[PDB]
UniProtKB/Swiss-Prot annotation, chain E:
Subcellular location: Nucleus, Nucleolus
Shown part of the complete sequence: 459 to 552 of 661
Function: Involved in the biogenesis of the 60S ribosomal subunit.
Origin species: Chaetomium thermophilum (strain DSM 1495 / CBS 144.50 / IMI 039719)
Family designation: Belongs to the TRAFAC class OBG-HflX-like GTPase superfamily. OBG GTPase family. NOG subfamily.
Protein name: Nucleolar GTP-binding protein 1
Length: 101, 183, 96, 110, 90
RNA sequence: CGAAAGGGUCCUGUAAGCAGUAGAGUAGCCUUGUUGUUACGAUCUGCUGAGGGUAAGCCCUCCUUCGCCUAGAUUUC
């Protein structure tokens, strides 16, 4: 279940987007910027156990290995395999392009 | 001013329409309406929602490979203003719109080619299994046509076809129930 | 409803008409902002009683675009031709 | 020019007449609007509804009235002695494939 | 101008060109059959209330002679040749 | 004028049904596997921005239909 599903769509309850997840997977600098926007001592497991695919911190290595068997992690894997939706795909959907000369 | 496109659904985003989401990585997302905005906030994939240009382009129901789509682009190198260039550009836009519409109609017909064969085969199957539901004349009508043919010395089958044509022209529906006569 | 920079030949009436009014087929006055009445209501326009003291009264207005999309919903199209060009060919088009 | 005894089939758009109506009252209000529609159509204050028409209105419970309905209204003579009105209308439900797309029609006498 | 050359090339090649009574007949017959099926389903919907009550068995209700006459007559049976009047009870 | 209908404009999100060398696997019949085959099987794809709704306080329609009409009653320097 979802904790406090009534206010799930509030901006203060927002979660990291899938295109950001792909960019974190592709380049470690973008992931490092996202991690520098956080505080290490206030994270589960002091930030040592992180799932990039779910964009989620975990209290222990066995907890990370545990959620990997779950279906939300597999949903994130299949969504990343399909590919997230970007502005390039948005322009290709309407047949629009960029002319740089 | 200019016309944007919705990030989620691709519809023309005119001024003062929709809302823009400013993400902290440097991304601005323009939505034409609160429908697209709320679907984005629910993290629904536009490629899976069948009412979007993203789904239609992924499914191949939009004409994407054509020469008429190479004329509109985001021009990042500006051109010095020229009155004749703008006028011939306007004429080009009109003619390109006409050609794009005609080729799009052709594309849609090649999408919908095999329909007529499918309904013909289904119609033949349905009639073959339901020969008994085809329109027919009443028994009293057959008796009266037989006696009229015997009286007039005419073709009974011809009278049958004419009477079938008359009931084919005259369509009547039936009503449920009926009034109960008071005492 | 056409301007010097928008070359679409269009009238002031939105697509589907004005909601609960109909179509404007006569001369019309476009006024900035809101006015005390509602739709269908008779309005009296009067000359200003005094000479104006603001620069806004002496400004010259230059329009670039007038919205003519539907106000019966989230209308994204200014003309029926624009809507048909965006949508494409429908099932009823080949049915007709 | 129109005779007293005459039957026509109509399509009644009950959706716009039941818009916003309380759920426990939608189907009786539908019956009353059918009676008012028949009175306005035929000029008769005496309207009698078929029990099959009542069943058709009540098919999906008290708040599941169909948006459209095809009916036949028959203005007939009231032959009973001491009748307040000389004419009355009888409303029946009509078996059709689809109540949409149909115009008002006059039922042939035969 | 290249687009115009392409347009006239496909017009010469036949890209914009546009194209049976028995097929129309069989489609009309299928549509008539579908309408009859819809009417039968509507009759079933009218007669059935199995959510609340059971249908009275047909053997417990005496069928009217006029209704049997009408139904067989539309089905195409000359009822005068078989004499349902003698078969009907009173 | 009214009731339908048609067109538009909006809302939702791709109907029922049929088909498919799509479908994880399972079980039979035989060519005992060579989409072997047939059967079932969440779902997927196509017909299908389709189906459904649309004034109830949306718009248009002498030129898409059917009806209605110069009343009745009461009062008045
Ligand atoms: Zn949008």
């Amino acid at each position: 279940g979802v904790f406090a599903k009534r206010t799930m769509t509030k901006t203060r309850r927002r979660l990291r987007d899938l295109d950001q997840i792909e960019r974190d997977l592709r380049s470690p600098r973008h992931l490092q910027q996202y991690k520098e926007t956080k505080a290490a001592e206030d994270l589960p497991g002091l930030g040592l156990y992180y799932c990039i695919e779910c964009a989620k911190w975990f209290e222990s290595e066995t907890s990370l290995v545990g959620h990997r068997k779950g279906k939300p992690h597999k949903r994130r894997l299949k969504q990343l395999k399909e590919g997230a939706y970007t502005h390039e795909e948005a322009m290709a959907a309407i047949g629009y392009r960029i002319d740089n000369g | 001013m200019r016309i944007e496109n919705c990030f989620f659904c691709g519809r023309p985003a005119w001024p003062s329409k929709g809302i823009t989401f400013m993400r902290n990585d440097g991304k601005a997302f323009r939505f034409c309406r609160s429908k697209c905005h709320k679907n984005f906030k629910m993290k629904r994939n536009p490629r899976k929602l069948k009412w979007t240009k993203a789904y239609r382009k992924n499914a191949g129901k939009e004409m994407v490979v054509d020469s008429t789509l190479q004329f509109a682009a985001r021009r990042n190198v500006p051109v010095r203003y020229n009155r004749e260039l703008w006028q011939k550009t306007l004429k080009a836009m009109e003619r390109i719109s006409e050609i794009r519409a005609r080729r799009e109609r052709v594309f849609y017909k090649k999408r919908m080619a095999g329909k007529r064969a499918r309904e013909v085969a289904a119609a033949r199957k349905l009639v073959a299994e339901n020969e008994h539901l085809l329109p027919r004349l009443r028994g009293s009508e057959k008796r009266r046509l037989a006696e009229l043919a015997a009286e007039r010395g005419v073709d009974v089958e011809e009278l049958e076809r004419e009477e079938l044509a008359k009931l084919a022209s005259k369509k009547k529906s039936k009503a449920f129930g009926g009034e109960v006569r008071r005492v | 409803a056409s301007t010097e920079t928008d070359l679409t030949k269009k009238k002031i009436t939105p697509m589907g008409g004005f909601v609960r009014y109909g179509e404007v087929n006569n001369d019309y006055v476009m006024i900035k902002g809101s006015v005390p009445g509602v739709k269908k209501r008779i309005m009296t326009l009067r000359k200003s009683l005094f000479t104006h003291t603001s620069r806004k009264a002496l400004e010259k207005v230059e329009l670039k675009w007038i919205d003519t999309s539907s106000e019966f919903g989230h209308g994204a199209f200014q003309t029926a031709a624009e809507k048909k060009q965006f949508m494409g060919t429908l099932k009823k088009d080949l049915q007709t | 020019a129109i005779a007293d005894v005459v039957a026509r089939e109509y399509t009644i758009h009950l959706h716009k007449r039941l818009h916003g109506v309380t759920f426990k009252k939608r189907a009786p209000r539908a019956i009353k609007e059918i009676k008012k529609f028949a009175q306005k159509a035929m000029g008769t204050s005496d309207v009698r509804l078929d029990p099959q028409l009542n069943k058709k209105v009540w098919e999906q419970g008290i708040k599941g009235v169909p948006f459209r309905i095809r009916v036949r209204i028959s203005r007939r003579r009231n032959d009973e002695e001491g009748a307040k009105e000389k004419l009355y209308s009888y409303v029946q439900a009509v078996n059709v494939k689809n109540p949409k797309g149909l115009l008002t029609s006059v039922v042939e006498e035969e | 101008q290249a687009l115009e050359e392409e347009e006239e090339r496909l017009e010469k090649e036949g890209f914009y060109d546009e194209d049976d009574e028995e097929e129309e007949e069989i489609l009309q017959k299928a549509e008539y059959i579908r309408e009859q099926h819809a009417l039968i389903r509507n009759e079933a919907k009218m007669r059935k209330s199995l959510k609340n009550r059971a249908i009275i068995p047909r053997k417990a209700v005496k069928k009217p002679l006029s209704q049997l006459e009408d139904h067989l007559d539309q089905l195409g049976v000359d009822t005068e040749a078989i004499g349902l009047r003698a078969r009907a009870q009173t």
